[model samples]
Target chain A: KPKLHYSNIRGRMESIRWLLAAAGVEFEEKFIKSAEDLDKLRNDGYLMFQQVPMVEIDGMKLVQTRAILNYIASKYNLYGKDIKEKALIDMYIEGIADLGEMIGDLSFSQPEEQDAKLALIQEKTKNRYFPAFEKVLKSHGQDYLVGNKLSRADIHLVELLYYVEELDSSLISSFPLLKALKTRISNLPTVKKFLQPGSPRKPPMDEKSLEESRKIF
Target chain B: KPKLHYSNIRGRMESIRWLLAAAGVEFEEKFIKSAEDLDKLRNDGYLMFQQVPMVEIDGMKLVQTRAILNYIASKYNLYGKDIKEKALIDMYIEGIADLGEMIGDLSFSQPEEQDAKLALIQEKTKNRYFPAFEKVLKSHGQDYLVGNKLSRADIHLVELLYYVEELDSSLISSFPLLKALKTRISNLPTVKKFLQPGSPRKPPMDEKSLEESRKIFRH
Candidate 1:
C-alpha cells in the first residue's frame, strides 16, 4: 500500500490520486494541515514529492511530481508503448510541471503582481504554449495525446483542465481546443462520476486548503 | 533521431547526454551559441524544459532537465526494473535537484546573503542531506544507491559531486561515503573518458552584460 501526503484541498496531489485511481493502484491519503505537519514530513522516509502530492510506495520515497506521474504511468501502461510515444508523453508531462511551477509562483505574489504574472502567462499560453498543446490535440485528431487510446498525457490534460477550470473558469473561453479537451476529459464516466457536483465524497484532499490554493490560481 | 538544442556547457544537457550514452542511444547534439538562437527556440512548436538543455525527440521538443533525465532513464532502463527501486531513485534525483536549486540560487544574492545560503546548505549537507545520501550508499553496500548495481541515482551522485566540488570543496570532507561514491562514478571508464577536466568552462549563460548578476555567486 502507498500513503499519499497532501493538503485537504485538491492541489498537485489530485493529479497523483487520479492517476493512481486510473491505474487502479490502491493508496492511502495523508492530509497534512499546517507547517508543523509539513515540517515533520521533511523526514518521513517515504517517497516525497516536493510540494504536496507526496506518494510513498513500500517504504521508499520519491519526489518531483512529473517523475512520480511517469513512474505510475509506466507501471500501468498509461504513458505509451513505444520509446517515441514515451518521449512525447514525457515532454508533455514535463511541460505541465513547468507550467505548474510558473502558476504556483505567480499565485503567491501580491494581488497586483499576481495579475501581472497572470497576464504574462496568459499571453504566453495563448500565443505560444497553449497553441503547441493545441497542435498536439489536433495532431491526435481528438482521440488522445499519443495514441488512439488514453495515455498519461490524456490524464495530464485532465489535470491541466482541472487546474484551469477550478483555478479560473474564465480561462476556458480563450483556448477553445483546450477547453473542449477539458470538457471531454471531465466527461469521462469515471471522472464525471467523481465530479457529479453534489456527491458527498473524499476529494483525495482537504477542502479548506484547496480553496485557499485555488484562490491564487 | 532527436536533436538537442542547448549551450555547449554541461549545465542541463550533460546529464541527459550521459544517460543517452550510457544507453547507447544515438541523437544529434545541436549546440546553440547565441542568445538569439535561444530566443528563437522558445517559439519552436515544441515542449522545452523550463530552461535550457532542450531536446527534440521524434519531433517532440522536451524541456526541463529532470524531465529529460527521467525520460532518458526510462528509455535506457536506468530507471530500474521494479516499482520500489524506481521511486526510490526518483526521490534521490529530486533531492539533488532541490539541493542544487538552493545552491544555484546562492548566486542571485549579495556576498553576505550568498554566503549565508551556501553556509546554510553546507550545514544542512553536513548534518542531514549528505548523511542521508551516505545511508543510501551504505545500505546499498557502497557500490551504488540501491540493488547493488549502477542506477540513475549513481549518475545523480556523479553530477552532484561535480556540482558540490565546483561550488565548495569542503563538501566531501565529512561524508566519505558520498565522496568515495562520487569518485567511483567520476572515475568510471566511460564517464571519465567524456568528462575530461579543463579550465572550468564559461557559464552557459553569459554574465558579461550583467556584471552585477554575476556577483551573486562571487563567493
Candidate 2:
C-alpha cells in the first residue's frame, strides 16, 4: 500500500482515517502545515488536488471521499455479505454524503443564514431523505444501518450524526432510529475508546463550538 | 428503465442524458417549470430527492450526478474495460465535479469578493488541477480523458470544459491541453449537436451570465 498523505484536521481525511484505523489497515501520512505548503504538497499527488480526503493504493490514486469509501468497502469486502445489502448499503452511504455536503455548505455560509439553510435542507431531509433512511433502518430493527453487520455506511452515518449533534441536536430528535443507532455507535468498544477523554480523534470544544452546540440544542 | 423527471435545461442532467443518447436508451422526462416546483415535484420522488439530477433504474432510485453516472455507465458497460481504467475514469470525472463546485461557489459569493475567489481558485487550478488533468490527457495521447475508447468520463470532461467556457473562459485558456481538448470535444458531431447554438437543453443567457461571459472573453 502507498503512503497516505493528508491534512491533520478531520476536515476531509477523517473518515478515511477512521476507516483505515477501524479496519487496521497499515498506512502512513504527511500533514501539510500551511496553505502554501498545501500547494507544494498537492501535485506530489498527495494533497488530493485541494479536496483534502484522499488515499493512494498500489501506486494508483483515487479522489472524492465517497469514491474512496466505495472502493475501500468493495476492496475490503466490508460492504456486506449479499447483493441487496450492497445496494442498500450504497444508498445509505450516498445519502449520508449528500447530507454531509449540505452541512458543510451551511458552515461556509453567513452565520445568520446558516440556520435558514439548515432549516430548508432539514425540511427536505425530514420529509424525504430521513424518512427513507428511517424506513430502511427500521426494516432491520437498528442493529446496523443496513445488512446484518457493520459496514462503512454505518460508520459514515455515525460520523454524520455526530456532526448533527454538534451542529443541531434537534436533528437527532427528528429520527428515532438514527438517535438510537448513534448511541450504539458511540458506545461501541472501539468507538468508545476513541471518544473517551485524551483520545486524539475527539475534537476539543472551544467557546464557539460550545455556543454553536447550545444554539442547536 | 424508469422515467427521468427533470427540468428542460440540461445543466446537471446533460451528462446522463447524453450518455443515454449515446448508448441508445430511452426514458420519460418531466420538465420542471421552476425551482419551487422542483421542491414539490421532488417530494413525490418525481424529481427523485431534492435534487435536479437523479435516476430510477429498474425501480432502484438513485441520486447524485456522479453516482447516477456510475450506475448507468456500469449497466451500459460504459464505465471502463478494466479496474485500472475504471478507477482512472472515476477520478477524472470526480475532479471535474470538484472544479465545478469550486467555480459555482465562487460565482455565488459576494460580487465584490468574486474576483479574489476567482483569482485564488484560478491560481489553484492553473498550478495544480489543470496540470494533473493535462498530464492524464497527454498520457492518453490527447484523444480522451481516460481509456482508449469513449467512456462517460470523456463526455463528462467535454461537458465540464464547456461549462468552464461558459463560466470562465480564461480558466480554460490557462491550460492549452484543456483549451484544445474542449474544442476537440466540441467539434465531435454528437457533442456539437447537443451544444448546438440553440438547443433546448442549453440555458438561455441571463443578464448576469451574459455580462460574465462578455467579461470572460475580454479578460
Candidate 3:
C-alpha cells in the first residue's frame, strides 16, 4: 500500500483523499504538522522536490501533488483511454492545478488581509473561472469534466467546489453544471460513504457552515 | 504540421524545441511580439491558461507549457515505455518545472537587481539543486536523466543548462556529469544542426555570450 505524507490540514490532500476513496484503494497516512516533523522527513531523504503530499508507492517515493495524482489515476485506470483522451484529461487537470494555486494564495494569506483575499477570489470565481468551467462542462454535454465519464479531473472539480464553498457559500450557485457535478460525485457509493456524517474526510468547517456551503453546490 | 505559438524569446519554448528536434518532429513556429499580437491571440481565445507557449495540434489549442510538452512527448513516444517509467519521467519533469520557476524569477527580475539575482542563483545551483541532479545522474548510471534512453526530462536539463550558462558562464563548471550531459545532447546531429550558426532556432544571445557559455560545457 502507498503511504501518503502530508499535514493533517485539508489543504491539497483533499483531492488525493477523494481519488483514493473513489478508486477504493487502501493506504497509510503520515501526518506532519510541525517544523520538527518536516525536518525529520527531510533528514530521512523523503523530501524530493522538498515539498509535501509526497507518497511512497510501488517502492518509489514521489513528490509533486499533480504528478502523484496522475500516477494514482494512471494506476487505477482513471486516466483516459487514449492519447487524445489523455490530453483532454491533462488540460482539465492542469486547469484544476491553476485553480488550486489561486486557492492556495487565498488560504495562505495573512488573516488580517483574508477578507480582501476572499473578495478577490469571489470576484474571479464569479466573473471568470466558473464561467469558463461552465462553458467547458456545457460543451462536453456530459456530467463528467472530460471523456464523458468519471475521471480524476472530475474528482478534482468536486474537491475545488467543496473548498470554494467553504470560502464563500454563495459563489457556485450560478453555475448549474458545476453544482450537478458536485452532487453526482457525492452520490457515488464509495465517495458518499467516505463523506458521511462524522467522516474524517469531511472538511474541518463546522456543520452550520457546511450546511450553508452546500446551498451553493 | 503543428503550430507553436510563442514569443521569439527562448523563454519557455526551448525545451519544447529540444523535444521536437530530438524526435525529428517538424512544427510550425508562430512567433508573436508586441502588445498587439498578444492581444489578438488573447481575443481569439487561445490564451486559455492566460500565457504563451500554446500549441495548436490535432485541431485543439493547448495551453500550459508543461501540458503542451507532455502532450508532444506522449505523441512522439518520448514520454516513457511503461507506467513506472512514466512516473519517473513525471517526477523529473516536475523537478525541471520547479527549476524553471526559479530561473523565471531570475529572468524577470529588474535590470538593476540582475546581479543579486544571478548571485543567488549561483549559490542555489552550487549548493543544493545541481548537487541533487548530479546525485540522480550518478545513481541512474546513464547520460539520461530519467530512463536510459532520451526523454523530455533530459531535454529539459539541457535547456536549463544552456540558460544557466547564459546567465553566468562559470555556474555549471563544478558539475561534471551535468557538463557531459550538455555535450551529449548538443552533439546529437539534429540538435547540433538546429543550434549551428545562422539556424533560425538558435537563441538571440550574442555569439560572445554563447562562446562563454560553451566553455563550461566544452571544458
Candidate 4:
C-alpha cells in the first residue's frame, strides 16, 4: 500500500486521496499531529521540499503536490492516451489546480476575512471557473473531462466540486454540464464509498482545524 | 513558427523561449505593450485563464505556463524516455520552479525591501534548494539532471542559473557539481547561441519595464 504523510485533515492530500480512491487503491496515511512529527519526517529525510503532502510509494518518497498526483495518474493509467492527449489532460489539470489554489487561500484566510473570501470564491466560481469547465464539457459532449475515459483532470475537478458546492449548494446550477458531471462522478462505486461519512474522506476544515493546520505547516 | 504573447520582459515566457531555442525551434513574439494589447487577447478568447504568457502552436491556443511547457517538451522529445523518467523530470522541474518563483519575488520586490528579499532568496538557495540539487547531481553523476541526454529539466536549470548567478555570482560556489553543470549546459551550441547579445533572449527586467508591466497587468 502507498503511504501518505500529511496533516490529519483534508488539506492538500484531499485530491491525492480522491485519485487513489478512484483508482481502487487503498493507501495508509501518517497524520502529522505536531511540529515534532513534521520535524521527524524532515530529519528522517522523507520531505524533499520541507513541506507536507508527501507520498511514499513505489519505493520512493515523492513531494510536490503536482508531482505526486502526476505519478499516481501515470501509474494507474489515468493520465491520458498519448502525447497529444497528455497535453490536453495537462491543460485541464493546470486549470483545475489554479482553482484549487484559490480555494486554498480561502481556507487559510484570517478570521475576519473568511466570509469575504468565500464570497469572492463563489463569484469567481460562477463567473470564471465553472463557465470554462462547462464549456469544456459541452464542446466535448463527454461524461469525462478529457477523452472518453477517466483521467486525473476529471478526478481533480470532481474533488474540487465537493468543496465548492459545500460553500454554495447551488453553485453549479448555471452550468448544466457541470451539474451532470457532479451527479455522474458521485455515483461511481469507489467514489460513492469515499463520499460516505465513515470512509477516509474528511469534510472541509473548520476554524479549529485551520488553526491546527496553521501551526503544522 | 510558433507565436508567443507576453510583456516585453523575461517574466514567465523566458523558460518557454529557452526550451524552444534548445530544441532548434524558431518563434516570434507579440509583445503586450499596452493594456489594450492584453485586452484584445482576452477578448479573443485565447487566454484560458484570462492571463498572458499564451502561445499559439500547432493550431491551438495554449494559455497556462506549465501546459505550454509540457506540450513543447513533448513535441521536442525532451520530456523523458519513459513514465518513470517523466515523473523524475517533473519533480526536479517543480523544485526548480519553487526556487524560480522565490527569485521572482526578489525581482518584483519594492525598492526599499529589495535588499532584504534578495538576502532571503540567497539564504534559501544555499540552505534548501541548492543542497538538494547538489546531492542529486553528485549521486547520479550525470551531466543532465535526469537521463543521459538533454531534457527540459536541464535547460530550465541552466536558464535559471543565469538569473540566480546574476543576483550573486558566488551563489553556487559551495556546490561544485552545480558549477560544473552550469558550465556544461552553457557550452551547448544552441544554448550558447541563445546567450549571445543579439539573440532574442531578454536581459533581466528593469524598473521602467517593471512599471510598464505593472500597468498592463493592473488594467
Candidate 5:
C-alpha cells in the first residue's frame, strides 16, 4: 500500500484522494497538522518542493499533485487509450487545475478585496471558462469528461465542479452536461463509499474558508 | 509539420521551442502581437485557456505549456524510458515551473516592492530550491536531469538557468552540474541551428523589461 502525506485540512489533496478511491486502491493517509511536523517531513526527503500532497508509491516518493495523478492514472489504465486521447485528458486535467486555483485565490483573498475579486472571477467563469467546458462536455456527448470511459480527468473535473458549485451555486446551474458529469463521478461505487460516514476523504477546503467563500460568491 | 502559436516574444513558449528544435521537428511559428490580433486568436479557439504557447498538432490545438511539452516529449521519446523515470522527469519539470513562476512574479512586481521581493526569492532559491536541484544532479551523476538521456526537463532547466543568470549572474554559480547542463543543451546540433542567424526563436522577455531587469540586478 502507498502512503499519502498531506495536511489534515483538505487544501489541494482532494482530487488525489478521490482518484485513489475511484481506482479502488488501498492507501494510508499520513495527515500532517503541525508546522514543525510538516517541516520535519519535508526535510526527511518525503517531498521535493517541500510541499504537502506527496505520495509514496512503488518505494518512490513522488511530489507534484499532477505528477502523482498521472502516475496512478497510467498504472491503473485511467489516462486514456491513445496519445491523442491522453492529450485531451491532460488538457482537462490542467483546466481543472486552473479553475481550482481561481477558487482557491478567492477563498484565500482578504475580506476587503474579496468582493472585487469575486466579480472578476465570476465573470471569467460564467462568460469564458465554463462555456468552454460546457462546449467540451456537450460535444463529447458522454458521461465522462474525456473518452467514453472513466479517467483521471473525469475525477478531477468532478472535484472542480464540486468546488465551483460550492463557491457559486447558480454559476454552473446552466450547464446541464457538466451537472450530469458531476453526478456521474460523485455516484461512483468507490467514491460513494469514500464519501460515506467514517470515510477519510477531506473537504475541498476548511470550514471557515468555505463559509467565507460561500458569502463572497 | 505542426504549428505553434504564441506571442512574438518567447515568454512561456521557449522550452517548447527547444524541444521541437532538439527533435529537429519542423513547425511553423505563428506570432501574435497586437491586442486585436490576440483577441481574434483567442476567439478562434486557438487557445483553451485564452493564453499563449498553444501548439496545433495533428489538427488538434492543444493548450497548457506543460501539456504540450509532454505531448511533444512523448512523441520525440524524450519523456523517459519508463514510468519511474517519467515521474522523476515530471518532478523536475514542475520544480522548474515553480521557480519560473517565482521569477516571473518578481519581474512583474511593483517597482517599490521589487527589491524586497527579489531578496526573498534569492534567499529561497539559495537556501531551499537550488540545493534540492543540486542534490538531484549529484545523485544522477549525469548531464541530463533525468535518466541518462536528454529529457524535456533538461531543456526547461536550461531556460530557467538562462533567465536566472540574466537576472543575477551569481545565483546559480554554486550549482556546477546545472551550469554544465545549461552548456550541454545550448550546444546541441539542432538547438545550435535554431540559435543561428535568421532563426525564429525569441527572447523570453521584451527589451524594455530586460533592460529594467538588468538595472535592478546590476545595482
Candidate 6:
C-alpha cells in the first residue's frame, strides 16, 4: 500500500484516491492537520515543490499531483494501451481537471457570490463539459472512455460526476450515458467499499477543515 | 506539417512551436484575427473545448496545449524511453507549467502592480525554481534534464529561459549549468533557426499585440 500526505479533504488529493480505488490498489493516508506537520514534510525533503498531495510509493517520494497521478495510473495499467489512447485519456483528464478547478472555485466563493458561481458551473457542466463526454460515451456505447477498458479518463469522469451531482442530483439527468457511466463505476466492489462510511475518502470540506488547511497551505 | 490555430502572438502556442522545432517538425500557423475566424473553427466542428491553441495534427484537432504537446513529444520519441522516465518528465513539465503561469500573470499585471509581481517572479525563479533544476543538472552534469537525452522538459526550460532572461539579462547568472543549457539548446540547428529573425516565432507581446488579442480574449 502507498502512502498519501495532504489535508484530510477531498481537494486535489481526492482524484488521486479515486484512481487508486479504481485500480483496486489500497493506499494509506497521512493527514496534515497543523503547520508543524506540513513543515516536517518540507524540512524533511519529501516535498520537492513544497506542495501537498505528495505520495510515497515505488521507492520514490513523488510530489506534484499530476505527476503522482500519472505514475499511479500508468503503474496500475489504467492509463491506456498506446500513445494515441493515452493522448485521448490525457485530454479527457485535462478537461476534468478544469471542471474540477471550477467546482473548487465555487466552493471557496464568497457566500454572496455562491449562487451566481454555482449557476456558471451548472451551465458549463451541462453545456460545455458533459455534452462532449456524452458524445464520447454515445459514440462507442462502451462502458469506458478509451479502448473499451476502464482507463484513467473514465475514473476521473465518474469521480467528478459525484461532485457535480452533490450540487444537484438531477443535473446529469439529461445525459443517460453519463448516468450509466456513473452507475457502472459506482457498482465496482472497490469503489463501493470506498464510498461507504469510514473508508479512506474524506468528507466534503467543512469550514473548520478549510480553516485548518489555510493555516498550512 | 501540423497546423496551429491561435493568435499570431506567442501565447500558449510558442511552447508547442518550441517542442516541434526541437523535434525538427515544421508547422504552419492559422492565425485567428477576428471573431468570425474563431467562430469558423467552432462552427465547422474544430474547437472541442472552445479554446484557442487548437492544433491540427495526426488527422485530429487537438485543443488542449498539454494534450497537444504530449502527442507531439511522444510522437517525436522525445517524451521518454520508458514509463519511469516519462513520469519524471511529466513531473518536470508540471513544474514548468506553474512557473510559466506565474510569468504569464506577470506579463498581464497592471503598471503599478507590475513592479511588485516582477520581483516575486524573479525571486521565485532564483530561489525556489532554479535551485531544483541546478541540483538536477549538477547531479549528473548531463547536458539535459533526464535520462541524459534531450527531452520535452529540457526544451520547455530553454523556451522559458528566453522569456525570463528577457526581463533581466543576469537573472540566471547564479545557475552555471542553466547557462550551459541555454547555450546548448540555442546552438541546436532547429532551435537556432527558430531563434533567428524572420522565422515563425512571434516577437515579445507588444501593446498593439496585447490590445488586438484583447478583442478576442477580453482579458
Best by lDDT: 4
Residue-by-residue lDDT tens digits, candidate 4, A1-217: 8899988888789889999998899999878999889999989988776777888888778888888888899999999988778878887788888888888888778869888988888888887788888888899798898879988888899988888887788898888898888888889898888888888898777888978887876
Worst 10-residue stretch by lDDT in candidate 6 chain A? Answer: A201-210
Worst 10 residues of 5 chain A by lDDT: A208-217
lDDT score, candidate 6, position A109: 64
Per residue, candidate 2 scores C-alpha lDDT tens digits across A7-31 of: 4455556677666555546566766
How many pairs of residues collide in each model? Answer: 12, 0, 0, 0, 0, 0
How does model 5 score on DockQ?
A: 0.57
DockQ of 2: 0.31
Pairs with backbone N, CA or C atoms under 3 Å apart (clashes), candidate 6: none
The sequence of per-residue lDDT tens digits that candidate 3 reaches over residues B1-219 is 788887665566667777887777777888775556776887888876555778888988887776778788998878888888888888777777777777776655556897887788788777766877888888867978766887887777787788788777787888899989999998988778777875546464444533543342232
Give lDDT tens digits, candidate 1, residues A1-217.
Answer: 6887766654556678777765556677777767657767765544332255677764545566655775788778997777667667766776776666666666456566766877776765556557667777777666677767778777776776665554557755776777777777667776665556643224432335445555422
Position B216, candidate 4: lDDT: 92
User: CA lDDT, every prediction?
Assistant: 0.66, 0.65, 0.76, 0.86, 0.78, 0.86
Ranking by DockQ: 6, 4, 5, 3, 1, 2
Structure candidate 2, residue pairs in collision: none
- lDDT by residue for model 2 over B1-219, one digit each (tens)? 545655564456667776765555666676655555666755675433456566677666666566566667776777787656776776777777777777666655667997887777767666767777878777657477766677877777776666666655677665777777777766766666666664434563455654554343232
Per-model chain B TM-scores are 0.80, 0.75, 0.84, 0.97, 0.86, 0.97
TM-score each candidate. 0.82, 0.76, 0.87, 0.96, 0.91, 0.97
Residue B58, model 4, lDDT: 89
Please identify model 6 stretches exceeding 4 Å from their true place: none
Cα-lDDT of candidate 6: 0.86
**Which of candidates 4 and 6 reaches a greater DockQ?**
6
- Better candidate by TM-score, 2 or 6: 6
lDDT (tens digit, per residue) of candidate 4 on B1-219:
899899988898889999999898989999999899998988888887778789999887887889899999999989988878887788888988988998887788888998888998889888888888788888879888887888999998887778888999888889899899889888899888888888889888788998998899993
Residue A42's lDDT within candidate 3 is 73
